[PDB]
Symmetry: C5
Subunit: 205 residues, 5 copies
């Protein structure tokens, strides 16, 4: 359709790209995790591998449009390259995250963007006692690597991690999986930094 | 040489790229698998490695042309970068898919496109009992990561996976291989998401 | 160096790139293998690792020039990116080929191009009996992934693989190595596809 | 905000990029290490893997501005690609460094730049005696690969490595971690080269 | 700085890039190796891993300048991408070379260029007898992949490999390390190909 072709150029090729949030014009990114599998556990390096998808959501006034002015188009899909995306990083990874999904995001007329990156992550986790009935607990923090609390804010729609798509025949059972917002102060910086703490209690099936 | 150079310019450099399907202008992608080998089976992580090529076909009105107006050219080969391609993704992969073939597609005057990506896939599968006479059964779903059934529809020309090119001296005998269209409903969204379920039954040779 | 700078500009920057062969403009690519080493044999996955270089050769009328019109220059070296190159692919690889040589080709005034890519290949090969006196035999087909026989034809200057540069202290002895042209018919396509079959009989040193 | 979009334009797109330091216009880069984990130790190759983040800091006159002239903007985040960055390299690495953080730096109105790359490093370290109560000591030098002392100078805000974020359940305890500036002389060059020596004494739990 | 920025524009953005050497305008590249460590020895595949840096040196008339006309600037550092670099390749590698240093070269007013790439190399080497007092000897040839002797010539400033920076606590002692120039003849070509043979005799510590 000719209508959608016009909207994409009337937004991206017509205006310069979003320079990211500022202290004056902050941004709130809504985070959410859907855990798929605990693939590997390396007891000799205390490295644990997770397969999950991360639901990222934010709103930009620069991405708004009137659907009536563009042939009643409410939303559209686009390459994550064509738009600004938050630098949400795992604070205890041991190897670069592996992307398992297409780099496509969906933009809506109200300016809200949704990005659902699937990934394989290796993080610092001591699995001592995973073989027990009680199980072992491990956590990993996610947040911006460069933006403070005054620039990028985080939130979760639920504190419960989505386990509805967890791999039934995994070598590891999930006992609990939690996503909790945290406000931390680091020596580096006078301003606070926000993260979402992914905490999973698991055991050998 | 000169006629083909002109056609490619008029199709890609003159008109804007296809913005993908919409609910109003959907698309049907025909899927098909040609299984080559079951390379590896990791019983400690329940990860199984597949080598296959998936034939994907779709038709675009934006890609039509009159062969008489372009020196009786009926079709041509082009980089998969020069054209829109469907985001068909494996829903239970454990590592990024490895591409084993050139990223070239073949376009025909009727607007039909054919892309046959060869790849190595590691997916979640419990291989317990592969050592038996009966063998073990495993499945993996393929479908769009961002487009719903209202935007991208999937179909198969047959429900029989092409095993004509399966590696005769593989460590694993293929007992059966099936490709079935399935329509799923996810908690995530209020529209159905459709996929192609690849179901293999195999055993040790 | 001024003469060569003019020639390279007048060929590539003056004319649009070669859109690849067609049935009206066919092409014959001469193939040849120089086997260097059989590095690894994985009996649990039936994957064998080769190190070789393949000599690719073709001729383009679009790449012809008068040496007298360009300061008696008969030939020149150029990046494989600056020119069209055939999509010669291994039909039974298990992992993406690893390039071990620079991506440079040599162009001659008659329009003939020579490209000698060195590479490490992992392909489907059952090594059962490599430990015997008789040894084990394995094969791998090479050919275009998208072009038929009426677009790209293949030929060999000899059926005998160059073993003159094979690694003397390899863990595996080559008993024989053959390169044979094959014309194959696939259901997919009304035209015959053509390839070069690399067959190597080898054993433990 | 357009105020920032105009500043990024007037800095980078208006002026040519910084050609790096010279003997006439030198630069001092402030270095600092935050050690996160000692992931593994390979006693058969004497290779040790570290996870840490490097804090890089320098000031450019070409990057300073009056905040009042650009809507009271004191600082901003930007891709490490659109700015010059020092070539600080590990002098005893055994494999290419793996980047674990986004390639974003923060520029301030005074022309001071801060870059905090997180990374996984494999370096030459003999772990003989890591099993003892005394532990083992290892070091790695960091510095410019091309710029000398007269071009790039290095300094540390402290000689103590930040261990505040070290992984509590690591297989290895840190006994001490030091960052010391060194001025060395190499045969290659008549001018002194300067580096920061990362020295860590550790032991297995 | 205003002065260096102008020279970098007048050198690269003014004139077209160097099309490489020809038979009429040859080039002599001076090679030199600084061996850092023998990391690994794989007796089951006869693959040995080296960590070293390779000093490359050549002179181009196209890169000459009058320092007085450019604010008494004698030399400058630049990306290896901005300039032509020789295709010096290891003739017996088993995996792609891993770069361990920044891709920056230093250009001098006389047109002489220096490039010092650090790298990790896996090459064909039978380590049988490394455990003995006598040790084992291994070699690897380095040279152009496309240019003959009549186009690129190689030379060494010394036949002795720099062992001054060899890793003190390496699992392997160097008994001798030699960098000798060789002129050979291959079947492929009527012109002689020239190379530098890196020969290292080593044993277990
Ligand atoms: C969350 N951070 C990492 C944090 O220190 C950390 C590191 C490892 C484990 C747990 C937390 C904090 C802040 C961002 C990110 C990287 C570090 O970043 C910084 O040091 C910083 C960031 C911006 C400007 C100046 C300095 C520290
Ligand atoms: C099928 N999906 C993956 C799902 O997690 C899954 C995993 C394993 C087996 C079967 C389905 C479901 C739906 C499409 C695809 C990607 C995910 O996509 C989404 O959740 C989504 C996509 C677009 C807009 C808003 C949300 C979840
Ligand atoms: C030679 N081909 C691959 C070969 O048959 C093969 C078979 C099994 C596994 C791996 C390679 C054949 C033909 C080209 C190439 C890729 C495949 O291509 C096709 O099926 C095809 C090609 C062009 C248009 C429409 C369909 C099969
Ligand atoms: C520290 N360097 C390496 C050094 O030789 C070394 C190597 C291994 C271990 C420890 C130090 C020194 C100086 C920078 C870096 C690379 C080498 O660089 C050079 O030899 C050089 C640099 C610029 C112009 C001409 C030559 C030597
Ligand atoms: C040294 N070469 C490889 C050589 O055959 C070899 C291969 C393995 C081990 C030792 C030497 C020789 C020459 C360069 C390089 C690549 C090969 O290159 C060629 O065959 C060639 C080069 C230019 C024009 C036409 C053909 C052969
Ligand atoms: Cl693994
Ligand atoms: Cl590992
Ligand atoms: Cl493997
Ligand atoms: Cl290996
Ligand atoms: Cl390793
Ligand atoms: Cl040998």
């Amino acid at each position: 359709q000719a209508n959608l072709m016009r909207l994409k150029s009337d937004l991206f090729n017509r205006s310069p790209m979003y320079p990211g949030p500022t202290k004056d014009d902050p941004l709130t990114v809504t985070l959410g995790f859907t855990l798929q599998d605990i693939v590997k556990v390396d007891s000799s390096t205390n490295e644990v591998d997770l397969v999950y998808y991360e639901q990222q959501r934010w709103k930009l006034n620069s991405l708004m449009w009137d659907p009536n002015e563009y042939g009643n188009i409410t939303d559209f899909r686009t390459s994550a390259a064509d738009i600004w995306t938050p630098d949400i990083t795992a604070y205890s990874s041991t190897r670069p995250v592996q992307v398992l999904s297409p780099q496509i995001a969906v933009v809506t007329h109200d300016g809200s963007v949704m990005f659902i990156p699937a990934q394989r992550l290796s993080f610092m986790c001591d699995p001592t006692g995973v073989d027990s009935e009680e199980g072992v607990t491990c956590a990993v923090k996610f947040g911006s690597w460069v933006y403070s609390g005054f620039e990028i804010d985080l939130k979760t729609d639920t504190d419960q991690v989505d386990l509805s798509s967890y791999y039934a025949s995994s070598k590891y059972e999930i006992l609990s999986a939690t996503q909790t917002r945290q406000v931390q102060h680091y020596s580096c910086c006078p301003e606070p930094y926000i993260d979402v703490n992914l905490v999973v209690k698991f055991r050998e099936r």
